[PDB]
Amino acid sequence: TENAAPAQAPVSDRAWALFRALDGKGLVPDGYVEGWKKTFEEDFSPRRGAELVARAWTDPEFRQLLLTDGTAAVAQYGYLGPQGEYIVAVEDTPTLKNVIVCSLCSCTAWPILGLPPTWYKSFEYRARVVREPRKVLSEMGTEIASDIEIRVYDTTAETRYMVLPQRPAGTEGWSQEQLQEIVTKDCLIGVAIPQVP
């Protein structure tokens, strides 16, 4: 039919065929894709960006390094990696809320945010948050007042971003571990604000 999908084998069969075609020719080192699967699942993680935020929240000197040379700050923790070699942290303020997207595909600071979630890669987010971020965040559960500028960072080149959210009231005196727990993946992407019990 007009506009109909092309015939295709099941995607699992195509993906493993690509693997076997290359592996059968000796082009994939032993344990290579298993190695990456483990890195993607276990090493790349938003718990790293949470650690960075909690440190910034309790150490003004580190907060200043993270906001002026995010790469160097992240490197002190050993968290540079693939899709996270040039880092810029953007700070929320009482009059500014930052949000990150890749409208052209899915670019994300993998090592400190984790691989992007399905929703971030959706056509809905990619199309809409650059033009109506206030409505998108509202639908997602985050109300941003009229008096706050929203700033959308579109990840179109090699800068890889993380949001430094504001530290919420009611966390005075918390330890870095307590603070880390309320900085979630969505806080680092910018669509959520850290929540205090």
Partner: protein, 211 residues
């Protein structure tokens, strides 16, 4: 390339399928899903057969209706497979035999790409710049919403990278350029039809000119 992948600003989509901090499930939701990224890095770092930019472009080259109905990770299975065939490493025949069925690929490129521009300017923070009013049929890391628009420099990177419009085609003349965080007012990009404040696009030097 003014393809359907350039989605920012398109109107008519519904809700983002997420509310804050909802369960997103495991990193991979099927047992094959780690293969596209993994085999991309094999191609880049082990085979030296293509660049990450060539992966972005080959996904841009999916037939447009095919792009629009294909889940994210499957687009990268199709893209990496396409590159492996284009670079001479695999054939489509052997992929379809192993797969047991059809394995349509991205469409051939209709552009040879373009070199890193010879004349550019080093901009400073605070300067006003305009995005060059240029149309590029091959790969480019400029979303069309900012073409021809004016913004202010917030940052010039302290590193440089090969120009995507060249390395995304595997060319030898990608050079190296810094990129610039260019802040645009929302009304500059979408007039009255936005609820936002500003948008910062990370633009290669060769996409910009003095305002």
């Amino acid at each position: 390339m003014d393809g359907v992948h350039d989605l920012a600003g398109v109107q008519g989509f519904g809700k983002v399928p997420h509310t804050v901090n909802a369960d997103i499930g495991p990193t991979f939701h099927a047992e094959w899903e780690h293969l596209p990224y993994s085999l991309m890095f094999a191609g880049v770092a082990e085979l030296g057969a293509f660049s990450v930019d060539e992966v972005r472009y080959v996904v841009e080259r999916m037939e447009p209706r095919h792009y629009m109905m294909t889940p994210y990770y499957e687009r990268y299975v199709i893209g990496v497979a396409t590159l492996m065939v284009e670079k001479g490493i695999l054939t489509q025949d052997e992929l379809e035999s192993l797969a047991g069925g059809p394995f349509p690929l991205s469409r051939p490129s209709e552009s040879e790409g373009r070199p890193a521009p010879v004349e550019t300017t080093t901009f400073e923070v605070g300067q006003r710049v305009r995005v060059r009013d240029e149309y590029v049929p091959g790969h480019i890391r400029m979303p069309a919403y900012c073409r021809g628009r004016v913004g202010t420099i917030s940052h010039r990177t302290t590193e440089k990278w090969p120009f995507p419009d060249a390395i995304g085609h595997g060319r030898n003349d990608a050079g190296e350029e810094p990129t610039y965080h260019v802040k645009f007012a929302a009304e500059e990009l979408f007039g009255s039809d936005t609820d936002g404040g500003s948008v910062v696009v990370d633009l290669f030097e060769g996409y910009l000119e003095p305002a």
